[PDB]
Amino acid sequence: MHRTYSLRNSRAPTASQLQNPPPPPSTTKGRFFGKGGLAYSFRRSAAGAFGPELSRKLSQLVKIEKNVLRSMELTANERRDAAKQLSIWGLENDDDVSDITDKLGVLIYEVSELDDQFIDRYDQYRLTLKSIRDIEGSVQPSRDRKDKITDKIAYLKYKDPQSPKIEVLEQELVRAEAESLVAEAQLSNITRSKLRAAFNYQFDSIIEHSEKIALIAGYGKALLELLDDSPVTPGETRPAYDGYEASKQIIIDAESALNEWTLDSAQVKPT
Amino acid sequence: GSVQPSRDRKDKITDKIAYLKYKDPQSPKIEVLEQELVRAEAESLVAEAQLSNITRSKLRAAFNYQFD
Amino acid sequence: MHRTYSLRNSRAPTASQLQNPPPPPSTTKGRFFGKGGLAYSFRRSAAGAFGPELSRKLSQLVKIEKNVLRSMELTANERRDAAKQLSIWGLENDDDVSDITDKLGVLIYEVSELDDQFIDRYDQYRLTLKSIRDIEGSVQPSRDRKDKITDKIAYLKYKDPQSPKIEVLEQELVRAEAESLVAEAQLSNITRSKLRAAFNYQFDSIIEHSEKIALIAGYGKALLELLDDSPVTPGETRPAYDGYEASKQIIIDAESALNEWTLDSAQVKPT
């Protein structure tokens, strides 16, 4: 988060924000529950009511992550349709305009397919989170039994300190305690391992997607440079278009670079 | 008789693990069930040890009292 | 109290009062019962009517202390809101003014959170007072029984000095007296211990809060020094503001000093 020490819900402008004023807030921000509907909210609340207490939060996280994946795939499909129909509109235009919008449509198609691949990786990470949820929520009943048996032992001791069940219940409490402390140890180990692996995978997918999208954007801007933005004076003829070969090579190079990209090929250097 | 259900749970869980492995060796429940089997086994072998100890002590004391 | 030997409800001016004339009395002193309402007064009176006689005063003290804590938390929340909305007003002003009022708002926010911490300590001290009230008010019925039994013994002796109940009642009076004198001894011991511990805790919290607030005030005055109070002549332009970094370091140092403060770090030296 970028907030400086102030009560303001506004952050100090960065270098990009200093370069130009930020655009006004989106006009599509309507008034609603802030999420669109209620069925997924009911699912989330059910995850927050019925599940075991100590696993309830992680089950809710898994459900919300599934919602995020659903929304991401839906918006990727919608972006694909938008690119297709944008190029459809650009078909009946100037030949230069038609070619430029067609190539932009292909680039957005690549962006959509890369989004789909990142979505598959994101679902793999979500499955890992589901696995850690499962193991930890199945290790919870050990401590549940420990708490129940210690409460029963306290109640029996208060009611009848000389009851014969005291010794056997004490052995059982010891046994659940040996079952439980070291189970906590194993749970911590597996939680650390699974969390580290899943988040490393997720961040590798994130950086790969970001770098591929950045390369696509750079190639698209270089190809936009090809577009002739010089206006033609009223009443004049249309100059001939000869950018088929240049955009031809540009899209060829974009595909070649996308094939060539590797995890080590990432040029992002954190400091 | 109260230490018996520990081995009962161990046998039930090992049967369930064998059945799950036969039905689906790649099922996600295999790992958690294996941890639970380990846990019941750590619960059970040393419980057998303690049971042997307490059985020896109680039997010796009771029979010494009876014979006296 | 600062009153000198005079009938005046006025005290000799101190060095601070000698430096400048005291401000006139507050204009918000309205006419009312002097406390605002009646429900808490009813609670206090109920504490002063229904409870055991010798514990009634301490129960009243606990109730009044709860009232004080309620008022303190309410005024801390109101001060927090005042700081927030003051900085809100200062948002639409000069950039120097905006920054200075924002940092002052953060400082008052720190004052409010320190007040909340002191309030928690004060409630711990109030709970200790409640504990001493409980033990002493539960030891009162021993002396109550002693007084009742001695009155009964006197009445029986007057009515029938040869009654057979005289001897058994005398043994019971002896027994309550052995129950009561040494109970007074134990009550004195526990009262001394609890009072000393609770008041030491309260005064430690008081001095910690005072020192932290004093450091905040000193840093705030040093930061007010940063403000450019030089007026600009009519019709002129606004000089550029460059105090972001200086206030940046000032608030950083204030936070560092607040972290560094310890009980032994207090620089107040009573003589």
UniProtKB/Swiss-Prot annotation, chain B:
PTM entry text: Phosphorylated by PKH1 and PKH2. Phosphorylation is inhibited by sphingolipid long chain bases (LCBs).
UniProt GO BP: eisosome assembly; endocytosis; protein localization; protein localization to eisosome filament
Entry GO CC: cell periphery; cytoplasm; eisosome; eisosome filament; lipid droplet; mitochondrial outer membrane; mitochondrion; plasma membrane
Phosphoserine modified-residue sites: 27
One MF annotation (Gene Ontology) recorded for this entry: lipid binding
Keywords from the UniProt entry: Isopeptide bond, Lipid droplet, Phosphoprotein, Ubl conjugation
Subcellular compartments: Lipid droplet
Top-rank lineage group of the source organism: Eukaryota
Phosphoprotein found in the keyword field: yes
Keyword Phosphoprotein: yes
Primary role: Negative regulator of cell wall integrity (CWI) in unstressed cells, probably by inhibiting protein kinase PKH1/PHK2 activity and regulating their downstream CWI pathways PKC1-MAP kinase pathway and protein kinase YPK1 pathway. Activity may be regulated by the transient increase of sphingolipid long chain bases (LCBs) during heat stress.
Note: Present with 2157 molecules/cell in log phase SD medium.
Full protein name: Sphingolipid long chain base-responsive protein PIL1
Organism: Saccharomyces cerevisiae (strain ATCC 204508 / S288c)
Taxonomic lineage from the root: Eukaryota, Fungi, Dikarya, Ascomycota, Saccharomycotina
Gene: PIL1
Full-sequence range covered: 137 to 204 of 339
